[PDB]
Amino acid sequence: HMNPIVVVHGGGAGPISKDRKERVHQGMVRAATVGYGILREGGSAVDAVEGAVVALEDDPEFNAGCGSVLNTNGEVEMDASIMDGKDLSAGAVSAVQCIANPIKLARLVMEKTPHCFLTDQGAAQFAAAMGVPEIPGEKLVTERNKKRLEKEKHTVGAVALDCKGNVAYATSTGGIVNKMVGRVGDSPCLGAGGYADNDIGAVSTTGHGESILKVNLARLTLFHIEQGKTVEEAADLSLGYMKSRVKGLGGLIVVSKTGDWVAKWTSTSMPWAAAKDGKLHFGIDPDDTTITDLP
Amino acid sequence: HMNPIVVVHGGGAGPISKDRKERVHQGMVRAATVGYGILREGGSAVDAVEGAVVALEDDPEFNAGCGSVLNTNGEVEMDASIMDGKDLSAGAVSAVQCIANPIKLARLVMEKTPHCFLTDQGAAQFAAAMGVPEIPGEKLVTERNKKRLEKEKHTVGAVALDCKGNVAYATSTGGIVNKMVGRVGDSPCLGAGGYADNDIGAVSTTGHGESILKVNLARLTLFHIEQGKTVEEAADLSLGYMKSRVKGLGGLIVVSKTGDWVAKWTSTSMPWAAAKDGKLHFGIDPDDTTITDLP
Numbered sequence A, B: 001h002m003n004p005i006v007v008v009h010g011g012g013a014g015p016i017s018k019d020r021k022e023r024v025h026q027g028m029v030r031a032a033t034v035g036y037g038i039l040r041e042g043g044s045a046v047d048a049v050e051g052a053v054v055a056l057e058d059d060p061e062f063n064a065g066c067g068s069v070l071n072t073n074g075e076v077e078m079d080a081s082i083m084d085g086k087d088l089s090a091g092a093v094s095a096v097q098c099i100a101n102p103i104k105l106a107r108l109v110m111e112k113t114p115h116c117f118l119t120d121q122g123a124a125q126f127a128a129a130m131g132v133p134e135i136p137g138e139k140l141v142t143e144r145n146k147k148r149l150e151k152e153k154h155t156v157g158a159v160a161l162d163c164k165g166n167v168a169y170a171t172s173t174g175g176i177v178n179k180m181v182g183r184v185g186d187s188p189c190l191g192a193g194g195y196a197d198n199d200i201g202a203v204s205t206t207g208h209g210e211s212i213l214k215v216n217l218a219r220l221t222l223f224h225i226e227q228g229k230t231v232e233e234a235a236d237l238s239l240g241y242m243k244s245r246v247k248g249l250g251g252l253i254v255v256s257k258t259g260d261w262v263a264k265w266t267s268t269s270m271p272w273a274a275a276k277d278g279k280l281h282f283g284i285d286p287d288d289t290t291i292t293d294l295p
């Protein structure tokens, strides 16, 4: 049986407030442990990535679910995708409003529809039909995101490997601040915001969404892994190509089917945490990584 | 400088009857003629692919624009995307309504916004801003498509290389008949419905969208070329993979950076056409190709 692992991220970005680092760090910690606790029971890779991401959606320090950034209209529209590495089954939603957990809906699309990707109004209709509570549009909006929008008006994810050796990813976001209405980035798009294949590995992405789409970052990262590269080498190859070809910056987390894993980025920062073998790992800035025992 | 070449497809299909087959011919020659016309006239691969698909969008005989299949509530929902190989510039729309030419709307996304993908409500507001006409949904609904919907309950593309060596793809669709409200297929998804890259080539795909999304069919084809497989070898294996892994059928058109091209499909039939060196290649069933002179 495979030594299970979960990696998590809370979004590529620039410099982060030191005080905020503590809310983010604890955010990372709680999502990774949630993830590892679901795996602990011998739970599935899909379960673990879904659970990890639900936690980060509910945590207002991260741009997904509650605390999602605001579009040009000062409003929240969310993107999500989830993928099962066994049969490449996938679920995705784009442009969804006034709901707690985009990733759960994405999982609802994967499991309770013959499709893989629902959008905007039909995603809203699907949500209702599945008994997803509509939560007030103001409970997702925070004051710090309001001050983010005003200045400009003048993403979370997880990968897992379960005890049976399956891999999965989950990525969730409110997008980029001051985005057009109905803008869809890479997060809900298979191959871009993440990919998962048992014959290679699983990936969740973050960074400049258009650029991530343009280069199909998640799959590319795996193209390099098939071709015999280490998880690190491949991550640097893929992010380096996104920087070199289209001048976009980003980050990613990845676990291979051998359970070798890495977080690597070309944004200034990328909060990440991984749980493997009863230890929790954490980082924000490159070459600055701490490790603690995980009960 | 290179000889220009356009390849169009009219989508994967089951068996095609007598009447439909010849009508398919006419639409395909029109579109290949418009695209090639553009190419012989110093126009871009992007202009060529856009022109071809518009032709097939306007034509009620094809599943895109006028003549789109209807969703679960008798309404036309359309996806389209376009991509330029030079820089990986791209645009796309998903679940758009009440407009004749979603591919034209996809081009504006590329060239007028800083976004690559719009959906539904957002897409409509950007259409209104760009002056795209707002016709009633019914006028895109044909009589044939009314019939198939009541019967179910009980895609078009173009790739071009230009004289300047730019490659592009376009893909447009009405989706699949009786699709859930707001279901999004491969067609507006870079790497799925298509991919253009001046340094490899361009692919446009068709068939069961959910399969195409999962395997990233278009980008997968281009990967094979990158390994040194020829364009037909590339298509054979990428389509081969969609078959074994996700149980998925469809087809593609591919053009290498150097001029080579093919149409391949694992589905029953895929209407297609090509134009290069003053010749028109056309077929629907495997190896039925009529190579004729273009004046």
Ligand SMILES: N[C@@H](CC(=O)O)C(=O)O
Binding pocket: A011, A012, A063, A155, A173, A174, A175, A176, A185, A186, A187, A205, A206, A207, A208, A209, A210, A212
């Ligand atoms: N990839 C996200 C941004 C982020 O990762 O923060 C988007 O463009 O939607």
Ligand SMILES: N[C@@H](CC(=O)O)C(=O)O
Binding pocket: B011, B012, B155, B173, B174, B175, B176, B184, B185, B186, B187, B205, B206, B207, B208, B209, B210, B212
């Ligand atoms: N791929 C298209 C349908 C097709 O090409 O047959 C879609 O799923 O929307």
Ligand code: NA
Binding pocket: A056, A057, A058, A059, A060, A061, A062, A063, A064, A065, A066, A067, A068
């Ligand atoms: Na959040």
Ligand code: NA
Binding pocket: B056, B057, B058, B059, B060, B061, B062, B063, B064, B065, B066, B067, B068
């Ligand atoms: Na049409």
